[PDB]
Motif scaffolding. Structure first.
Motif, PDB file in Angstrom:
ATOM      1  N   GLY A  32       0.824  -1.193   0.000  1.00 52.93           N
ATOM      2  CA  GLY A  32       0.000   0.000   0.000  1.00 52.93           C
ATOM      3  C   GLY A  32       0.860   1.245   0.000  1.00 52.93           C
ATOM      4  O   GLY A  32       2.090   1.180   0.034  1.00 52.93           O
ATOM      5  N   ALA A  33       0.187   2.393  -0.034  1.00 53.84           N
ATOM      6  CA  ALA A  33       0.848   3.688  -0.085  1.00 53.84           C
ATOM      7  C   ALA A  33       0.505   4.493   1.159  1.00 53.84           C
ATOM      8  O   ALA A  33      -0.594   4.385   1.708  1.00 53.84           O
ATOM      9  N   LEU A  34       1.461   5.309   1.598  1.00 56.57           N
ATOM     10  CA  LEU A  34       1.306   6.127   2.792  1.00 56.57           C
ATOM     11  C   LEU A  34       1.575   7.584   2.449  1.00 56.57           C
ATOM     12  O   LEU A  34       2.581   7.898   1.807  1.00 56.57           O
ATOM     13  N   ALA A  51       4.171   5.419  -3.320  1.00 56.59           N
ATOM     14  CA  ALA A  51       2.946   6.211  -3.400  1.00 56.59           C
ATOM     15  C   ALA A  51       2.691   6.701  -4.819  1.00 56.59           C
ATOM     16  O   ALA A  51       1.542   6.719  -5.279  1.00 56.59           O
ATOM     17  N   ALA A  52       3.746   7.109  -5.527  1.00 58.39           N
ATOM     18  CA  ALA A  52       3.579   7.593  -6.893  1.00 58.39           C
ATOM     19  C   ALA A  52       3.019   6.512  -7.808  1.00 58.39           C
ATOM     20  O   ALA A  52       2.127   6.788  -8.619  1.00 58.39           O
ATOM     21  N   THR A  53       3.526   5.284  -7.695  1.00 54.40           N
ATOM     22  CA  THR A  53       3.004   4.190  -8.507  1.00 54.40           C
ATOM     23  C   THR A  53       1.589   3.809  -8.087  1.00 54.40           C
ATOM     24  O   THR A  53       0.744   3.511  -8.939  1.00 54.40           O
ATOM     25  N   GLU A 120      -4.852   1.391   1.022  1.00 54.02           N
ATOM     26  CA  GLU A 120      -4.815  -0.040   0.776  1.00 54.02           C
ATOM     27  C   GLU A 120      -5.785  -0.383  -0.345  1.00 54.02           C
ATOM     28  O   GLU A 120      -6.811   0.288  -0.506  1.00 54.02           O
ATOM     29  N   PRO A 121      -5.484  -1.410  -1.135  1.00 49.56           N
ATOM     30  CA  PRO A 121      -6.448  -1.871  -2.138  1.00 49.56           C
ATOM     31  C   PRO A 121      -7.660  -2.514  -1.483  1.00 49.56           C
ATOM     32  O   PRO A 121      -7.590  -3.059  -0.378  1.00 49.56           O
ATOM     33  N   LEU A 239       0.204  -0.044   7.825  1.00 46.95           N
ATOM     34  CA  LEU A 239       1.135  -0.219   6.719  1.00 46.95           C
ATOM     35  C   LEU A 239       2.590  -0.273   7.161  1.00 46.95           C
ATOM     36  O   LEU A 239       3.450  -0.620   6.345  1.00 46.95           O
ATOM     37  N   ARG A 240       2.887   0.071   8.412  1.00 41.92           N
ATOM     38  CA  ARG A 240       4.264   0.049   8.887  1.00 41.92           C
ATOM     39  C   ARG A 240       4.831  -1.362   8.812  1.00 41.92           C
ATOM     40  O   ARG A 240       4.217  -2.317   9.296  1.00 41.92           O
TER      41      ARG A 240
END
Ligand SMILES: *C/C=C1/C(=C/c2[nH]c(/C=C3[NH+]=C(/C=C4\NC(=O)C(C=C)=C4C)C(C)=C\3CCC(=O)O)c(CCC(=O)O)c2C)NC(=O)[C@H]1C
Ligand SMILES: *C/C=C1/C(=C/c2[nH]c(/C=C3[NH+]=C(/C=C4\NC(=O)C(C=C)=C4C)C(C)=C\3CCC(=O)O)c(CCC(=O)O)c2C)NC(=O)[C@H]1C
Lengths: 493, 493
Positions: A32-34, A51-53, A120-121, A239-240
């Motif tokens: 996931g991205a943060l 995060a960019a992707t 998250e997805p 997400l950590r």
């Protein structure tokens, strides 16, 4: 107690694993991205490399992108549901329909003045389990039901219920396991596996996740927060990524995904619900909410079940307990009223010896050590500050307590009044019992250690009975002092 | 305590409303169908009059219809999830797709050897509320949050949080109300509205429902169970129609639908979450499960919030409490160590008077009644069996306690040791306070009663402090008796 690993942390060894700051690792899992933004400005300050992707935008475009434009509709809800100054345990989960990913999961928790965004997805039997847990006859019966329910919901390979003893030692009381793997039920593990810093962290954040132990984490650019130039607190972020040494330790057992749900009873960590998967398996949030629901249900139901079990264990012993309470609350001279075999206080606690220290002189019953050992034990008990002293092992606590083990290894003592001047001692003979200890280490097989100088563990019902007996004896202490004061006055004048 | 109304029950009056058996009314609400079958045979024994219309089958066809054919797939699940001998609180809810009604709701709970089938029609913010309730700073803050969440979920007109005082009196602490209706917040109601039999019934069955107060219930044919020829226990059935007199009482307020969720803390009823609707409104089961989830969450969170609030209230008073604990635990003569104004034990409990009864002689501080009244109060306290006596009203408890009200209306007493020989008394002056009482009765407006001879209610923190002080004084009682016994021995020889 030390600066973070990436910016001035000491080398991680086995001894100093308690000094590694896990709440501020500076990296997140790649599933996931943060995003990190100010709660008052709305501009992203810290971001992850992935995060960019994940968002589909270029990193240059991501920098400086206001949350109002980033979140067309969630921003007013973000402000309304998360006022400044709320505790870090407050999380706001919203389903943001990102056009690039379709349906996306958004979870936000506020630490200080910073807003942490977790991306998250994302894409009926819970009530039956809800009622099943509440109908468990005993705590042990509840454990397999809860583990089986968790396994049915998630599908994890080894769904294990983890229980922590008061001495910070963990024992497995249940295991929902797929056929083929070795059962870990009954194994007891030391405090080294779970550091005390985790226990401090585990009570505030109940649920965690590890998508893949073989997946390398990604850092956050910039590492330090622009607001204070300090390590970013990532303790509350799901997400950590966990500790890399813990990642390797889990890899030693061939586990792909490892989730654990904390069980907190009365503000203190009671146990964990650990799950293991051979292959990596991300978990949709809509069932992670179900797992949190189950964790809270378990935390309430274990309290109810312990209360019921204590009541049932005490139920076996009204005759002895009521008889001794009637015969001790109204005793002017407890020495002649408690030492008679009619009461049989030795059999009430299932102990091999008993010491009756009243009016200075101490009277012993059953298996007792030689007199100098008795005086040494009495002095050591007087050194103890607590009113009630409970231990299944005098060998560890008393420096050379293995000598008393042939006579008594476990001890349950209640101090009538205070100061240990008048105390009751229960002596339990040593029983040679062995409990398997699991085996960072690489051994995860059966390993029974011949275990020295403990007695049968004291049941909570026995401790409650001891507390009640101490309370009633301290109550009768008032009548004792009243009659002795009458004697003092009458003999003085 | 009486046979059922339809088969030999006494006429229901206001006084004997506690004798009406509500768990066995012999009727159900007309919004669903009820079937009763043996748990070992599978043949329906009792049915409702509306069951034939609900299921679409003729009543002749319904009789003798085996549950195996009636439930093609739910029967094995019925047996597996409901073994014989399970408690009546075990409910199994399954979604049975009846072709006549499309999707239908099925809920089964077992009482004795009988299986009761409940049939009802059927067709993300819960986690946010889950986290919101856990982040409430205080109990009062949690109340409005919970009521607003319930109102948002259900849409009821008047979502009210009901709280029960220890004296079986109910007070409203929150109200989520639609604009226009009169706010009932702050009103306190007597024990007549909710009989003690309901309190006994309310702790085991937490959720209820009333689709329409103007809808007449339907009976069950046959009324008695064929197995034992006894009234059918319908206490655990949601479809059970409530008491007709209670239906009329609710109709007096113009309420169409009335749902209440029980809050149980430590096995005893803590309060209710009552909801009212002007118009009838059936409730889909998939959100009734959510309401049950909220009820359990509230039951856990009120315990946590009371613990936190007690800790915070005690937090204000370490200096006084620590000072008195240090100055009383090691006092050989508490008369000269507790009566000095330096400790100021009067201000610690915010009381107008204090009695120091040690060594027979009693020393009084602050506002105290005349000496004969003091001796009468001491004798009455000695008659009290409990170690700790707490009351905000000596006028009601003591037969002519209104005479002491100018000096003291509320009383908090702790007995050092036991037998009330040595006791501490806190005296609270009367404060003229009025609390509105709501108004079967037809008045549901504001009604404040001038209320006689009570003092400020004792905060739970004050009670905890009193318990701690009593414990430490009873601990020092041991040292007192030790030194007095040394004096006895030295002066006797
Ligand atoms: C001296 C430090 C060590 C260490 C660090 C560490 N461990 C955790 C968390 C966990 N440790 C666990 C222990 C076990 N895993 C097993 O498979 C078994 C037995 C079969 C045991 C006893 C467990 C279950 C956890 C929870 C993680 C999970 O499973 O989800 C932390 C905390 C990290 C975090 O919270 O992110 C740390 C720092 N582990 C060691 O074994 C020692 C060497
Ligand atoms: C002497 C018996 C009486 C009686 C019987 C009765 N009442 C209930 C249940 C409830 N009584 C409640 C009382 C109130 N309703 C209100 O609207 C207000 C104030 C605004 C009060 C104080 C409530 C809330 C309930 C719970 C029902 C619900 O709302 O869902 C029972 C129990 C019946 C059952 O459990 O099926 C009984 C037997 N009510 C009286 O008022 C007196 C005369």
């Amino acid at each position: 107690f030390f600066p973070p690993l990436y910016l001035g942390g000491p080398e991680i060894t086995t001894e100093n694993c308690e000094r590694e700051p896990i709440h501020i690792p500076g990296s997140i899992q790649p599933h996931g991205a943060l995003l990190t933004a100010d709660g008052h400005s709305g501009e992203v300050l810290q971001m992850s490399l992935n995060a960019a992707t994940f968002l589909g935008q270029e990193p240059t475009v991501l920098r400086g992108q206001t949350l109002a434009a980033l979140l067309p509709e969630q921003w007013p809800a973000l402000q309304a549901a998360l006022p400044p100054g709320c505790p870090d345990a407050l999380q706001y989960r919203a389903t943001l329909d990102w056009p690039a990913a379709g349906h996306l999961s958004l979870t936000v928790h506020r630490v200080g003045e910073l807003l942490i965004l977790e991306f998250e997805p994302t894409e009926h039997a819970l009530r039956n389990a809800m009622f099943a847990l509440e109908s468990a006859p005993n705590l042990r019966a509840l454990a397999e039901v809860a583990t089986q329910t968790v396994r049915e919901l998630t599908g994890f390979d080894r769904v294990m219920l983890y229980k922590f003893a008061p001495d910070a030692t963990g024992e497995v009381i249940a295991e929902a396991r797929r056929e083929g793997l070795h059962a870990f039920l009954g194994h007891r593990f030391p405090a080294s596996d779970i550091p005390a810093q985790a226990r401090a962290l585990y009570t505030r954040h109940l649920l965690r996740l590890t998508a893949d132990t073989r997946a390398a984490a990604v850092p956050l650019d910039p590492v330090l927060n622009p607001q204070t130039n300090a390590p970013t607190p990532l303790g509350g972020a799901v997400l950590r990524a966990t500790s890399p040494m813990h990642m390797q330790y889990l890899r030693n057992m061939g586990v792909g995904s490892s989730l654990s749900v904390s069980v907190v009873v009365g503000g203190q960590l009671w146990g964990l619900i650990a799950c293991h998967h051979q292959t990596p398996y991300v978990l949709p949030p809509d069932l992670r909410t179900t797992l949190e629901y189950l964790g809270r249900l378990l935390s309430l139901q274990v309290q109810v079940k312990e209360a019921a079990d204590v009541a049932a264990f005490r139920q076996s012993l009204r005759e002895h307990h009521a008889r001794v309470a009637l015969a001790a609350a109204h005793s002017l001279s407890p020495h002649d009223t408690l030492s008679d075999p009619a009461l049989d206080l030795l059999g009430l606690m299932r102990a091999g010896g008993l010491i009756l220290r009243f009016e200075g002189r101490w009277q012993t019953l059953g298996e007792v050590p030689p007199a100098p050992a008795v005086d040494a034990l009495l002095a050591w008990l007087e050194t103890q500050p607590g009113a009630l002293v409970q231990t299944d092992a005098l060998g560890q606590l008393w420096p050379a307590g293995a000598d008393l083990a042939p006579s008594a290894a476990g001890l349950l003592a209640i101090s009538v009044g205070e100061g240990w001047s008048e105390c009751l001692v229960w002596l339990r003979p040593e029983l040679r019992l062995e409990v398997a200890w699991g085996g960072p280490r690489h051994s995860f097989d059966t390993y029974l250690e011949e275990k020295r100088g403990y007695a049968e563990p004291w049941h909570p019902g026995e401790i409650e009975e001891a507390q009640d007996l101490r309370d009633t004896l301290t109550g009768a202490l008032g009548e004792r002092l009243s009659v002795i004061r009458d004697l003092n006055r009458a003999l003085t004048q």
